[PDB]
Structure 1
Amino acid sequence: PFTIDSARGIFPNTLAADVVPATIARFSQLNAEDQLALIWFAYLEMGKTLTIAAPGAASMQLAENALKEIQAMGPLQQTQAMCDLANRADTPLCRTYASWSPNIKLGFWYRLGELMEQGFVAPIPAGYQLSANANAVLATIQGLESGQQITVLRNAVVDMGFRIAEPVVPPQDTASRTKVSIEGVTNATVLNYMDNLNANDFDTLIELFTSDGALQPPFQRPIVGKENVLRFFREECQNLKLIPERGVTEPAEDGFTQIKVTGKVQTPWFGGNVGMNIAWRFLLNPEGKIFFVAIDLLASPKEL
């Protein structure tokens, strides 16, 4: 009776920060140069209090040829290439960009941001004024908590263009692994999920899932089956820090158990400087395997 798509409804009182997809949808309506200017503005102002971590060396190497090609272009053509990405135009650059994992896309724009600051890539025109709709989108972004701001910016970047990923880091040494503690939750599957993800131990992590089980990242559709979920762990889930705090455990239909945990997560892009408020919603089968886990970005503290 449980389907993945029906399991999406467990713990319906959980208020997700759906202002994030709402804002992305508004952003996606904008003129391309407005999109690019808006992120430049948001990025400049955010950088006054938050520092982005440098892209990894492997990621920089993978994006290097594309970056070099843009830098060699004349200023008008550099701007056109960036507009192509924002417009999701079909071009060789846009197809290369689309083959990249999120971290490589993010590191590509990190470097273009440095080069625009230095004047070596064509900057946003001086004195540029955003459109009416764009100004309102930027205002909305600047009113969000930092965890929601960086999620808007990430999703905007990942949406550009029209599989290349970083190498997979070896799992953390067993002796140096730390274990989480969750108020009210001693469920071994949940604790093993948190601890193995915190150790980048994706091969152990995936064995917690049913063959047909699914993982639903914030504001995304469920990723279904062990092959696809493992691919997602390896491409996108390295070096996270999960800090679960508290939870609740309840029976579900057919001998299943449903568990909701709240806490914080840190991305390696910002470390301890941005703590995202997160809920995990687990649906476990009678053997304790993960049939479904959703990860939600919460609308505020006071969803924790």
Structure 2
Amino acid sequence: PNIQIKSIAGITEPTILQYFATLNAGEFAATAALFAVDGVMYPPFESGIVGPDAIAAYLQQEAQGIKAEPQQGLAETSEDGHTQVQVSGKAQTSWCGVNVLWLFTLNQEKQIIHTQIKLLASPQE
């Protein structure tokens, strides 16, 4: 299946664009494949999910019907060769919509070692 994604201001990291594109297409396999073997997805509020297999199972049930809408981002390369990425935008679900900051850390080979979402909103929690 062919997938589409809106390009994200300040980001040309291909792993990051693919992460968003796959997610909005339902290809949770391709999304989880972007993680390294021991890569960790922390979603909002729930505990960390490890490895492509568990990650892709998590997405299959929970991440259906969410549309990620990243507007902008920044990427910096640390001393150890890892890449740190911040991306801001909106999530839209079938109930309501929120503002979101997505955090990624990629290895020397651009596999997602970990990613963490935080909502942009103050003690309504």
Q: 1:221 aligns with which of 44, 47, 72?
A: 47
Query: Aligned pairs, how many?
Result: 122
Shift in Å at residue 275 of structure 1?
2.2
Structure 2 residue 97 is the aligned partner of structure 1 residue 275: yes
CA-to-partner distance for each residue in 1:128-163, whole Å, 9 max, x for gaps? xxxxxxxxxxxxxxxxxxxxxxxxxxxxxxxxxxxx
- Structure 1 gaps, min length 5: 1-172
Identity of aligned residues (%): 41
Higher helix share: 1
CA-to-partner distance for each residue in 1:204-259, whole Å, 9 max, x for gaps? 11110001001001122211122211110111111211100011111234210000
Higher strand share: 2
Map 1:66-145; keep pairs closer than 5 Å: none
Structure 1 segments of 4+ aligned residues over 4 angstroms from their partners = none
Shift in Å at residue 297 of structure 1?
1.1
Q: 1:232 aligns with which of 27, 51, 58?
A: 58
Map 1:1-304; keep pairs closer than 5 Å: 173-174=1-2, 177-267=3-93, 269-270=94-95, 274-299=96-121
Looking at structure 1, the residues matched to 37 and 58 of structure 2 have their Cα atoms a distance apart, in angstroms, of: 15
- Structure 2 gaps, min length 5: none
Structure 2 counterpart SS, 1:213 = strand
Structure 2 counterpart SS, 1:199 = coil
TM-score normalised to structure 2 length: 0.91
Q: Which amino acid aligns with 1:239?
A: G
CA-to-partner distance for each residue in 1:26-73, whole Å, 9 max, x for gaps? xxxxxxxxxxxxxxxxxxxxxxxxxxxxxxxxxxxxxxxxxxxxxxxx
Q: Which amino acid aligns with 2:119?
A: L
Cα RMSD for the two superposed structures: 1.3
